[PDB]
Amino acid sequence: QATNLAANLSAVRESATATLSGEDFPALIKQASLDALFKCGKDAEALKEVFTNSNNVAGKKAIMEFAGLFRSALNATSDSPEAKTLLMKVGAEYTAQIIKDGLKEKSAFGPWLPETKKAEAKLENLEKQLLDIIKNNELSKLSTNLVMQEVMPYIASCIEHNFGCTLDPLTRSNLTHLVDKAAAKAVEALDMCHQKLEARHLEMQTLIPLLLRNVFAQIP
Amino acid sequence: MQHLDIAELVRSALEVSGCDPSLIGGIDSHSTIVLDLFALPSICISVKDDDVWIWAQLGADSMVVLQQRAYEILMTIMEGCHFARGGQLLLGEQNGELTLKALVHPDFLSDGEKFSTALNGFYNYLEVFSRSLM
Amino acid sequence: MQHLDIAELVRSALEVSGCDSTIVLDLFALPSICISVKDDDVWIWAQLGADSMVVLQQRAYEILMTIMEGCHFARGGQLLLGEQNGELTLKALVHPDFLSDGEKFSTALNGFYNYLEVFSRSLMR
């Protein structure tokens, strides 16, 4: 009897259209970091096109940083279904905001990066405090307030100091609700993550930076 | 490798496979030969500077589904392919679609029975890869 | 290709770079790589580490995307993944255009080391 191919053959024809197709190693290495993140999106290729066509230095830097942190989090969350689910969700949310944003001159990505060594240390230090608060704790009113006290000064620092944010100084003085609301969103993200979750502590430690950066990216 | 008539090779392999020879249209222009199939992507056969390639595009959403199924796809690739140079199928991308490709080893180009083994084997992998990307 | 001596081609490739059974090439400041002839095919390959088969599962997509960017000196335009001694391997079936002489083969070797560094970084945890 006929082979499966023969039995399922519908036609044999020729085509003049059907055709096949024919080194920057640092770029290759960078692409592989981005791919780990962009896999979480609806369409990784569409993400790569947005990124590649952007001229927003700070926005691209924010995404690259996130992608690097995402790789670390995948290292630490791959043995727990709750943690990997959390990671995949923050990935999906971040990447969806990339597509919605478009990485033009005015972008949700870039303004909330630390622009001095001091600011970088403040961010690392607050991330470490968040981990202490949560492991000392749903979050209580105490813990909630302590999170607020960690996050609000960082957000306010960015508004005060940053040039990656393109807003006029005088106009930035209208944004007190921005800081309150963003810090509350951070509480909510941390509170939900804590609910869903030594191994756990390492999971939280890698997740905190992503949850925070995703909150920053959702600031209107 | 040089007097090689790909149309005659294909015609002979399909005969070995028990194909209805009436389904075979005009092939002989030394373009890509295309086998259309009942529920699967079409199989393309082409000669590219003395290399014989068999390939198929795997579907409009294959690159997206690949984001979730890359491990299963890699395991499948690593299981090997006896009729391909290097013992392995290759993946590329054509028209925004993932492509499964076999650079056919010349051992499978000597006669129609041998080429039939390659074509039917490719069919089998096409089923498997396309289903893994569903 | 049955006149081809892989031992001499490697010697030549080293000479022309200013340097001094499967061949194991273990040079200063380079990872160990293997060069072998099998059935008229020339392979260059290397193992990628004790837990490379674990990281492969974790980073399959990323690793596959890098493979799909291609490799100009390989048959088929692409590096292959294999497995040896429980470790992932990166393998190049060397295209005959890169087997004609020492200059050409040194370019394949150089290229292999460059790609191996890329894949090593992809597999670090």
Quick check: is A210 in a domain?
yes
- CATH number for position A61: 1.10.4150.10
Side chain identity, residue C50: A
Tokens of A122: 């403040």
Q: Counting beta carbons within 10 angstroms of the beta carbon of residue C5, is it exposed (0 to 12), middle (13 to 18) or buried (19 or more)? A: exposed
Looking at residue B118, the DSSP 8-state letter turns out to be H
Contact A13 B33 (CB under 8 A): yes
Of residues B23, B31, B123, nearest to A11 (C-beta): B23
Residues 6+ apart with CB under 8 A from A41: A47, A91, A92, A95, A96, A98, A99, B67
Residues 6+ apart with CB under 8 A from A181: none
Give which of A3, A2, A4, A17 is closest to B34, Cα–Cα: A17
Q: Which residues does chain C break after (C to N > 2.5 Å)?
A: 20
Give which of B1, A69, B70 is closest to C56, Cα–Cα: B70
Quick check: is A46 in a domain?
yes
SS3 sequence of B18-79: CCCHHHECCCCCCCEEEEEECCCCCEEEEEECCEEEEEEECCCCHHHHHHHHHHHHHHHHHC
- Chain C contact for A116 (CB, 8 A cutoff): no
Residue of C nearest to B103 (CA): C76
Q: Give dist(CA C39, CA C21) in Å, integer.
A: 13
Of residues A32, A39, A75, nearest to C125 (C-beta): A75
Q: Give dist(CA C63, CA A8) in Å, integer.
A: 35
Instruction: Identify whether the C-beta of residue C78 lies closer than 8 Å to the C-beta of residue B77.
Output: no
Give C35→chain B minimum CA distance, Å. 14
Q: Give dist(CA C112, CA C108) in Å, integer.
A: 6
Provide the CATH topology of domain B1-134.
Yope Regulator; Chain: A, (3.30.1460)
Instruction: Identify whether the C-beta of residue B29 lies closer than 8 Å to the C-beta of residue B2.
Output: no
Instruction: Identify whether the C-beta of residue B63 lies closer than 8 Å to the C-beta of residue B93.
Output: yes
Q: Give dist(CA A88, CA B43) in Å, integer.
A: 36
Q: How far apart, in Å, are the Cα atoms of A129 and each of A120, A122, A197? A: 14, 10, 18
- Chain C contact for B49 (CB, 8 A cutoff): no
- Chain C contact for B78 (CB, 8 A cutoff): yes
Q: Give dist(CA B111, CA B12) in Å, integer.
A: 8
Q: Give dist(CA A143, CA A129) in Å, integer.
A: 11
- C1-125 has which CATH code? 3.30.1460.10
Contact C62 A32 (CB under 8 A): yes
Side chain identity, residue C42: V
Q: Which residues does chain A break after (C to N > 2.5 Å)?
A: 22, 137, 197
The A9-15 sheet, strands edge to edge: A9-15, B32-37, B43-48, B51-57, B97-103, B90-94
Contact C67 B91 (CB under 8 A): yes
CA A163 to chain centre: 21
Looking at residue C10, the DSSP 8-state letter turns out to be H
What residue spans of A39-137 are helical by DSSP H? 44-53, 57-77, 81-101, 117-136
Q: Give dist(CA C120, CA C48) in Å, integer.
A: 7
- Chain B contact for C93 (CB, 8 A cutoff): yes
Stated as kind and residue range, the H or E segment containing B99 is strand B97-103
Give which of C56, C106, C105, C58 is closest to C81, Cα–Cα: C56
Pairing state between β B51-57 and B32-37:
unpaired
Q: Give dist(CA A93, CA A193) in Å, integer.
A: 14
Report chain C residues whose CB lies below 8 A from the CB of B67. Answer: 61
Q: Give dist(CA C113, CA C107) in Å, integer.
A: 10
Quick check: is A215 in a domain?
yes
Method: X-ray
Tokens of A193: 């993550």
Tokens of B36: 């259309």
Neighbours of chain B (3+ CB pairs under 8 A): A, C
Left if phi > 0, otherwise alpha if psi is -120 to 50, otherwise beta: which for B18? left
Please name the residue that has the structure tokens 């990307």.
Answer: B133
Q: Counting beta carbons within 10 angstroms of the beta carbon of residue C8, is it exposed (0 to 12), middle (13 to 18) or buried (19 or more)? A: exposed
- Chain B contact for C67 (CB, 8 A cutoff): yes
Residues 6+ apart with CB under 8 A from A117: none
* Helix C102-123 / helix C6-15 crossing angle, nearest 10 deg: 90
Neighbour tally for A131: CB within 10 Å: 17
HSE value, Cβ hemisphere, 13 Å, CA-based, for C72: 11
Task: Give how many domains chain A has, as a whole number.
Answer: 1
Q: Give dist(CA C46, CA C88) in Å, integer.
A: 9
DSSP string, C14-65: HHTTT----EEE--TTS--EEEEEETTEEEEEEE--TTHHHHHHHTHHHHHH
Look up the domain containing A105 and give its range: 23-220
Tokens of C103: 């200059």
Residues 6+ apart with CB under 8 A from B60: B96, B97
- Resolution to 1 decimal place, in Å: 2.2
Instruction: Identify whether the C-beta of residue B63 lies closer than 8 Å to the C-beta of residue B37.
Output: no
First to last CA, chain B: 37
Of residues C58, C72, C121, nearest to A29 (C-beta): C121
